[PDB]
Design a binder for this molecule. Structure first.
Ligand SMILES: Cc1cc(/C=C/C#N)cc(C)c1Nc1ccnc(Nc2ccc(C#N)cc2)n1
Ligand SMILES: [Mg+2]
Lengths: 556, 415
């Protein structure tokens, strides 16, 4: 015999304070029992399970399934209860590689390592918790009690311990063969390289010899699986990648579930298909949760769907990452808070695409949204490629500088360049820093009665111009905004406005260009038409003249 | 050499904090650092039966091209027991803030000489991520006291006290204060002497060491010169209606801090509905009220005390042209320190680098004055801060922070 190196066992514990499972074995038909007895006799012969005495108090139910081959029965040990009681593990699968971050490979060979899958030893002290019982024929003898000596399929810790054990075995080979890549998925090893095919196959033979040191045998035939690979919703080819075929169904009526599946397929396609949009389709799911409910599609949703079908009408492929070249990220504004981007290194060959949507909120502007999209893409790029791309943005350098130097928050976007492709992001208005000489001064105020929801909004000015408007179904805050709106509608191109509304100042100082409040949108549309606006704040109820007069007129 | 038992707070599990994305440069640096540490026995590889995690990254300290490993133990530090057994706590030295020079030394390397309780090691687990998650992350745990863990100075205290005894006896007027991995050394000497006493101090730890990669460095502070920012009102010969309105606004705000502030006479100058740029002569009544307000503002605030059982809160405002104002308090309107910065190093085009250096400076001042870090309210969107702060960090500690999304009117009053 050739001595094999053993796989060290991972020590496993139950969660603090919990004991093992003690679950009743269900009754089974005489036919299923015979099937389980034969199956387990072979598993015992292979070393995977071991017959036990009656002292062990633990138990997990075992079932027989069938339907795969000659309708022959299969075996299923239901570890749901043990899983609840088993400690948490470190999971490595949580991070899936993105295809756009992979490198081009000349050759990728697949090896089957499923013999290893069911041969990793289980911590000796934990085996007792895996006990199960095959019921006896007619319940006239004790059932056949057993326990697992190997990582049990269906047990919480088996995937993590298998991956850790294989990674430990492969680490020396990979470190000493830096001209290949190795990736484990399920019961397969994928080995890629750029070597000529003879050297590549040699490395594969060397990898097979390395695995035999731990007693791990690999099928000596050609693995069925060959490029392209269907993996995690992708198609991987040697020099290109794409998402698996995206087929949008035809339907005369759509249910909530239908739209959820459409949005899923569109979101998935958004990583390589440029310009996918889902706003109007996702709007149809707002606040609803009846999966069988049929929603009529807006004309807005029908155009968006029609535009998506056009984008999806033929296959689009992405390229892989060349580390010797810079990454470029280009962003476009799409409307309604939607942004789309492409990341590429060579012109016209995207590594990946994507989209960003405005966050829910009362007020917003294009510059903030663009900034947010940049920070999203930067973080995504760090994960996939480990570096920040150079950005191409539809915003003029001078617009950005005016924005960040005068914005009340700190803000920053990394190395970028203006790309002149409309619609451009711009600043629609800019408040003055100093009062305007020669411009009429409007002192504005509003007030409402909290019970009757009646109010007044108005202004008085230095030229003797005045207005008070009575309002219904309003609040103090709305009347504060209405008063500012009135001063804007009634002034010339340059105007000073004095308010005591902290609420209104907080909104305008956030510089929205679009709002959930139609009253704020009306103010914004007025501000855009002015040439100069100075907005001044004073404290209420302090005898500040001008202020004092109009608060009296409006609180009456 | 034999370990101090450590445990977590009651009813409290270990940290399970996601590793955030790291740049290729930081990963390569961490791989090199951790490979060496593993060979020297400071850390060991761990298996999947350890589900804990603390984020890690790397920093290039001021005036050094060597990368330093920084573990973000904020969550572990919250979850670790309080060490009120070694001492009820070392009374914060109030003289440290009064020395003309204080040098900050990185002494964290000394901690690696003390083993860590084998029953606690699992909670210091961390991961070196791979680009694109193409290979499994490298998982380690510490075998020795880690840099950045609040237990490290507590457990090493007894050893630090005896290493430093010869230097302290021989230099009794020196104030030495330890905060986490930092040693703060304050003297009233001329700087040349100061720098030579600092170097004297280095060789006590070199001697004892027998090499630490960052002990040679020296961050020099001068807390006796640290400036504060009282409330001042303009002195003008010509007041416009706008100037008087801004004055009345500022005085109304100041009257939440200072009781006897009055604006009646100044607000009656705003008598009518005048153009904002119109000049208003002050009445005698208004001049008097203004002068009385000025003299009130020259006094300290009433009822301001530090309470060590309460959090310090630091607020920061962006004032433009590289200027930032800040206030530290525990109770609103009861500022314990206010200040203003303008020397934003190498960041005239980068708001976020400036803000990050302000946060570090305010934390340093906080450690020197009270011996703990403040909780920040930052004028920045969370996403922007989370994406860039680590690129500009040069400190070995990390404070807590929250984000301000609504613009304060108070910005105007601290300008
Ligand atoms: C993540 C991953 C999944 C699969 C396979 C999953 C499956 N099924 C196979 C391999 C080898 C990898 N590993 C890596 C690592 C770095 N670059 C690459 N490039 C790369 C991989 C495959 C093809 C192809 N065809 C082309 C390039 N692969
Ligand atoms: Mg009012």
């Amino acid at each position: 015999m050739v001595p094999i190196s053993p796989i060290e066992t991972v020590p496993v514990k139950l969660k603090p304070g919990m004991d093992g499972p003690k679950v009743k074995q269900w009754p089974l038909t005489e036919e299923k029992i015979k099937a389980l007895v034969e199956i387990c006799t072979e598993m015992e012969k292979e070393g995977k399970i071991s017959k036990i005495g009656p002292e062990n108090p633990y138990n997990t139910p075992v079932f027989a399934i069938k339907k795969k081959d000659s309708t022959k029965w299969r075996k299923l040990v239901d570890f749901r209860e043990l899983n609840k009681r088993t400690q948490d593990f470190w999971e490595v699968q949580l991070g899936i590689p993105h295809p756009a971050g992979l490198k081009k490979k000349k050759s990728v060979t697949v090896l089957d390592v499923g013999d290893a899958y069911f041969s990793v030893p289980l911590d000796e002290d934990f085996r007792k918790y895996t006990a199960f019982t095959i019921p006896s024929i007619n319940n006239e003898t004790p059932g056949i009690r057993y326990q697992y000596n190997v990582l049990p399929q269906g047990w919480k810790g088996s995937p993590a311990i298998f991956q850790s054990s294989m990674t430990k075995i492969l680490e020396p080979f990979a470190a000493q063969n830096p001209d290949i890549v190795i990736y484990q998925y399920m019961d397969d090893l994928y080995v890629g390289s750029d070597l000529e095919i003879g050297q590549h196959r040699t490395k594969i033979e060397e990898l097979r010899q390395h695995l035999l040191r731990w007693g791990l045998t690999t099928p000596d035939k050609k693995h069925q699986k060959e490029p392209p690979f269907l993996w995690m919703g992708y198609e991987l080819h040697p020099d290109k990648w794409t998402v698996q075929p995206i087929v949008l169904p035809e339907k005369d009526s759509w249910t909530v579930n239908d739209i959820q599946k459409l949005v899923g397929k569109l979101n998935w396609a958004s990583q390589i298909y440029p310009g996918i949009k889902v706003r109007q389709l996702s709007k149809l799911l707002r606040g609803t949760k009846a999966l069988t409910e049929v929603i009529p599609l807006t004309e807005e949703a029908e155009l968006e769907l029609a535009e998506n079908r056009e984008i999806l009408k033929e296959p689009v492929h992405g390229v892989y990452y060349d580390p010797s070249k810079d990454l470029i990220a280009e962003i476009q504004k799409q409307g309604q808070g939607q942004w789309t981007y492409q990341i590429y290194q060579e012109p016209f060959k995207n590594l990946k695409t994507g989209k960003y949507a405005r966050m829910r909120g009362a007020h917003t502007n294009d510059v903030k949204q663009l900034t947010e999209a940049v920070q999203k893409i930067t973080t995504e790029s760090i994960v996939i490629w480990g570096k920040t791309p150079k950005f191409k943005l539809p915003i003029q350098k001078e617009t950005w500088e005016t924005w960040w130097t005068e914005y009340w928050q700190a803000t920053w976007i990394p190395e970028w360049e203006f790309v002149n492709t409309p619609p451009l992001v711009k600043l629609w208005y800019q408040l003055e820093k100093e009062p305007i000489v020669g411009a009429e001064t409007f002192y504005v105020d509003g007030a409402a009665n909290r019970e009757t929801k009646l109010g007044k909004a108005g202004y008085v000015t230095n030229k003797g111009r005045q207005k008070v408007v009575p309002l219904t179904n309003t609040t103090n805050q709305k009347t504060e905004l209405q008063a500012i709106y009135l001063a804007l509608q009634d002034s010339g191109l340059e105007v000073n406005i004095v308010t005591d509304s902290q609420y209104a100042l907080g909104i305008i100082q956030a510089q929205p260009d679009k709002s959930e409040s139609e009253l704020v949108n009306q103010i914004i549309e007025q501000l855009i038409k002015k040439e100069k606006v100075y907005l001044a704040w004073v404290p209420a109820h302090k005898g500040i003249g001008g202020n004092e007069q109009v608060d009296k007129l409006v609180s009456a | 050499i034999e370990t101090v038992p450590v445990k977590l707070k009651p009813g409290m599990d270990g940290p399970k904090v996601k590793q955030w994305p790291l740049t290729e440069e930081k990963i390569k640096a961490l791989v090199e650092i951790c490979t060496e540490m593993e060979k020297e026995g400071k850390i060991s590889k761990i298996g999947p039966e350890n589900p804990y995690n603390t984020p890690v990254f790397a920093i290039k300290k001021k005036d050094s091209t060597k990368w330093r490993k920084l573990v973000d133990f904020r969550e572990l530090n919250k979850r670790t027991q309080d060490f009120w057994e070694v001492q009820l706590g070392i009374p914060h030295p109030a003289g440290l803030k009064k020395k003309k020079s204080v040098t900050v030394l990185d002494v964290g390397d000394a901690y690696f000489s003390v083993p860590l309780d084998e029953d606690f090691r699992k909670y210091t687990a961390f991961t070196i991520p791979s680009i694109n998650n193409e290979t499994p992350g490298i998982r380690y745990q510490y075998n020795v006291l880690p840099q950045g863990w609040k237990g490290s100075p507590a457990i090493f205290q007894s050893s630090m006290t005896k290493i430093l005894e010869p230097f302290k006896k021989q230099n009794p007027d020196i104030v030495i204060y330890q905060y986490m991995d930092d040693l703060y050394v304050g003297s009233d000497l001329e700087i040349g002497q100061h720098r030579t006493k600092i170097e004297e101090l280095r060789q006590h730890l070199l001697r004892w060491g027998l090499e630490p990669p960052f002990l040679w460095m020296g961050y020099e502070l001068h807390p006796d010169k640290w400036t504060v920012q009282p409330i001042v009102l303009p002195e003008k010969d010509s007041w416009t209606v706008n100037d008087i309105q801004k004055l009345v606004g500022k005085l109304n705000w100041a009257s939440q801090i200072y009781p006897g502030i009055k604006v009646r006479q100044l607000s009656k100058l705003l008598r009518g509905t005048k153009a904002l740029t119109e000049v208003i002569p002050l009445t005698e009544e208004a001049e008097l009220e203004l002068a009385e307000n000025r003299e009130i503002l020259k006094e300290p605030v009433h009822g301001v005390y530090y309470d060590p059982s309460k959090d310090l809160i630091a607020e920061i405002q962006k004032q433009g042209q590289g200027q930032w104002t800040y206030q530290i308090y525990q109770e609103p309107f009861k500022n314990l320190k206010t200040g203003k910065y303008a020397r934003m190093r190498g960041a005239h085009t980068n708001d976020v680098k400036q803000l990050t250096e302000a946060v570090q400076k305010i934390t340093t001042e906080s450690i020197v004055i009270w011996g703990k870090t403040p909780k920040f309210k930052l004028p920045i969107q969370k996403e922007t801060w989370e994406t860039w702060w680590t690129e500009y960090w040069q400190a070995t500690w990390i404070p807590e922070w929250e984000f301000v999304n609504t613009p304060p009117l108070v910005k105007l009053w601290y300008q």
